[PDB]
Design an enzyme around this catalytic site. Structure first.
Site: not given
Ligand SMILES: CCCOc1ccc(OC)c(F)c1C(=O)c1ccc(C(=O)N[C@@H]2CNC[C@H]2NC(=O)c2ccc3[nH]ncc3c2)cc1
Length: 335
Positions: A30, A54, A148, A150, A153, A166, A185
């Site tokens: 996803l 996640k 966060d 945007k 999210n 998120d 961002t």
């Molecule tokens: C090097 C810098 C790293 O960047 C961070 C910096 C900080 C941090 O935490 C402090 C981090 F984890 C990171 C991460 O590595 C990171 C890893 C994965 C994702 C991610 O996949 N995001 C999704 C895509 N866009 C929205 C999100 N969608 C859902 O989450 C979701 C949830 C439940 C749901 N149910 N149904 C649909 C559905 C969708 C985001 C960030």
């Protein structure tokens, strides 16, 4: 809350406490991020029940000093019971990975829908903004800043209702206290963040104004080629930006009241709190009770064939990389 709602939450708690990782099968992806991804997973015993998982790489969290952020994401999101926030039911953990079992919303990310449609109509934007307002009302009442907001999210469920995801930058902040992390961002950061002055819940109202502007026009109001030019534009303020004619007078008035330079002057931060936002003229005639009751017809009705349909999401590359090293530092004890 509702007695029946409470009994359901307790039963749910008991149901997920019994589950193990081996009860699930992976369906598709996803979303992807820096050091992890979100997968659609299916419960082996009930084909109807799918979830979002996640999966984060522990060593990468440690290397980037994100431990307390991730701990806070679990606490805030697992304890939240809001129809406008994706639920976090529970977590799992092994030496390499953290696993967050979440409610699945298959209607798609608002960002991809905004991208494909270009911009949203006034009434469409109002519905999505009201969903955020309700999520904000719930979080702010418990002293929680979200930070966060945007379009990437906000997720739509199968009905077309929007929900926050998120919570990695969400944080509990005490009365009269401020927090100092520079995160988010470049287009969405409030001036008090840019200027390293400390920020509090009032940064969320700033971000709400940014979101309204982007949903209505397709782009945030302050944007530059590089982050540094963008920050300077933000410091110039919302009154220096020439709002496009497509933004209705009431929307523009609300955006400028949300994006006040002084955190204490921002709408939502005044005498009546969030009520000042909900009572703004832009929401005149909006049926908040029907939004909360699920009666209202969303502006965009997604097409979701089944609990395993990921067609409303982009395609995402598989992660076939060698697994990360073990992390036994123990910051993830509660997971
Ligand atoms: C090097 C810098 C790293 O960047 C961070 C910096 C900080 C941090 O935490 C402090 C981090 F984890 C990171 C991460 O590595 C990171 C890893 C994965 C994702 C991610 O996949 N995001 C999704 C895509 N866009 C929205 C999100 N969608 C859902 O989450 C979701 C949830 C439940 C749901 N149910 N149904 C649909 C559905 C969708 C985001 C960030």
């Amino acid at each position: 809350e509702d007695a029946e709602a409470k009994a359901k939450y307790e039963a749910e708690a008991a149901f997920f406490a019994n589950l193990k990782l081996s009860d699930f099968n992976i369906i598709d992806t996803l979303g992807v991020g820096g050091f992890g991804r979100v997968e659609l997973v299916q419960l082996k015993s009930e084909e109807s029940k799918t979830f979002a998982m996640k999966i984060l790489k522990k060593r990468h969290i440690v290397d980037t000093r994100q431990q307390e952020h991730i701990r806070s994401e679990k606490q805030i999101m697992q304890g939240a019971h809001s129809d406008f926030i994706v639920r976090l039911y529970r977590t799992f953990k092994d030496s390499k990975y953290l696993y967050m079992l979440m409610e699945a919303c298959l209607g798609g990310e608002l960002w991809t829908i905004l991208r494909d449609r270009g911009s949203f109509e006034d009434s469409t934007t109002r519905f999505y903004t009201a969903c955020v307002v309700e999520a904000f009302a719930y979080l702010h009442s418990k002293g929680i800043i979200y930070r966060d907001l945007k379009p990437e999210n906000l997720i739509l469920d199968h009905r077309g209702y929007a929900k926050l995801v998120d919570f990695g930058f969400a944080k509990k902040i005490g009365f009269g206290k401020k927090t100092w992390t520079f995160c988010g961002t470049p287009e969405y950061v409030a001036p008090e963040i840019i200027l390293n002055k400390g920020h509090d819940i009032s940064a969320d109202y700033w971000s709400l104004g940014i979101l309204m502007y982007e949903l209505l026009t397709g782009s945030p109001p302050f944007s530059g080629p590089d982050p540094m030019k963008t920050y300077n534009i933000i410091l110039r303020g919302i009154d220096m930006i020439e709002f496009p004619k497509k933004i209705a007078k009431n929307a523009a008035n609300l955006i400028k009241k949300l994006c006040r330079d002084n955190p204490s002057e921002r709408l939502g931060n005044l005498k009546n709190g969030v009520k000042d936002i909900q009572k703004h003229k832009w929401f005149e005639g909006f049926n908040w009770e029907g939004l909360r009751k699920g009666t209202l017809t969303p502006p965009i009705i997604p097409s979701v064939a089944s609990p395993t349909d990921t067609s409303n999401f982009d395609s995402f590359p598989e992660d076939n990389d060698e697994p990360p090293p073990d992390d036994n530092s123990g910051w993830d004890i509660d997971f």
